[PDB]
Design a protein around this ligand. Structure first.
Ligand SMILES: N[C@@H](CCC(=O)O)C(=O)O
Ligand SMILES: N[C@@H](CCC(=O)O)C(=O)O
Lengths: 257, 257
């Protein structure tokens, strides 16, 4: 039985209603739950969903050199596959493998409706509206590593902001936007942004274009015999239109706005 | 010296003005010429651009089973890398390797301006306006393999249309749209469509959403020592913003409409 690391992140992996009465995999639902079932069926594996203990995507500590999050679970042999909105990045590709993308996305801006912001440049040239991002993820790294003036300016502000503008979870970031009367904006992936825009109370909005262009991949540890089967499975699911059906199912068919 | 297979396709690879006075690689310009230069610089190779002799992207003949086009050049060892708008597909992944995507795209519809068509459904529901696609590529295979009702209907029409609606080159398809007074539409990748929309005589238009979501990758033959270096170089260029800069350079900075 293959251990699948994943993360509680709507609408990828969520608790069922009355999840406490279900056992194992049956506790959970969502895009990545369905994707896990689809891949497992295609490659012929039994699997067990294990929610990442630390609740993180995956970053490397500069001192200890230790990987945390889902990336860590793969690197240290605690999971055999990651099926999650895990961004394909250079630093991760050096330690784990990724399938070709199952979803395409870019970093984006979430505002409380009515906030006078439509671009990164708009955020960077002002201080009346605070902004932040998820901790320990690819978005934070994007800003830390950027050599583009506008993003450098945003990083310089965010890294020194007090109280901290980096959140433990996406939901925390969203909640912060919603309660801050337009005075906090959140930098997050277009996928999560567009999902939240269709959820009650319908008070948030994606503004401007995406900051970058990238993808999520299904990840495996180096040397895994699952690498090629997984890659081919993702491509088959893409070409068969199943990935499109799954996105429509979890984003738009269930839309509330 | 690494042999780089590529294809004459605007704005990826084009002849310089007065190409005839230049030698070797310096005869060419375009997005993929710049990409090859960037990749070679990162991985430390010398290279020679070789335009694919048959002028095809690459398909497997059902009878003889032989790969043609750029895919063929790699499979039979006539080239060491493909740097071109080559779509990452399942059937190709079975015979060659691809980097993670350097460009994201989907199939789209090109019309002559004023054509009463806004969607694939619009095309499938009528017979007055003919429509087709490129030979030996991923768009043709998309329609052949689709089980989506609308696309099945389009395939059934296109495969048996007289005169032929399939073209040998993208340029042929585009010329046919421009010359056919609204009575021909062309199915091609969003990237090519968007480029053409910004070129004189500014008489074409992309209509409707993309039919799928996929990527172009830099391709290498199985067992190539260049596989990993190429993959990391593409991700490095992505993360540094170079891919975005090159798209802007070749699509929009050079817009004519
Ligand atoms: N998908 C991101 C997490 C979300 C974010 O950083 O915006 C990652 O893999 O790290
Ligand atoms: N990029 C496609 C060719 C263009 C098309 O098929 O529309 C391929 O690699 O086959």
């Amino acid at each position: 039985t293959v251990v699948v690391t994943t993360i509680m992140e709507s609408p990828y992996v969520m608790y069922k209603k009355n999840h406490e009465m279900f056992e194992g995999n049956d506790k959970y639902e969502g895009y990545c739950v369905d994707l896990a079932s689809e891949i497992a069926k295609h490659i012929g594996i039994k699997y067990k969903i294990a929610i990442v203990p630390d609740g993180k995507y995956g970053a490397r500590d500069a001192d200890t050199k230790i990987w945390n999050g889902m990336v860590g679970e793969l690197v240290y042999g605690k999971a055999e596959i990651a099926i999650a909105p895990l961004t394909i990045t250079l630093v991760r590709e050096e330690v784990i493998d990724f399938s070709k993308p199952f979803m395409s996305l870019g970093i984006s801006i979430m505002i409380k409706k009515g906030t006078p912001i439509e671009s990164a440049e708009d955020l960077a040239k002002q201080t009346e509206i605070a902004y932040g991002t998820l901790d320990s993820g690819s978005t934070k790294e994007f800003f830390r590593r950027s050599k583009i003036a506008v993003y450098e300016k945003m990083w310089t502000y965010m890294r020194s902001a007090e109280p901290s503008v980096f959140t433990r979870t996406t939901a925390e970031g969203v909640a912060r936007v919603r309660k801050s009367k337009g005075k906090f904006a959140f930098l997050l992936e277009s996928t999560m942004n567009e999902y939240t825009e269709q959820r009650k109370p319908c008070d948030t909005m994606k503004v401007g274009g995406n900051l970058d262009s990238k993808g999520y991949g299904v990840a495996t540890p180096k040397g895994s015999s699952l690498r090629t089967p997984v890659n081919l499975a993702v491509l088959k699911l893409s070409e068969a239109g199943v990935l499109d059906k799954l996105k429509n199912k979890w984003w738009y068919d269930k839309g509330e706005c």
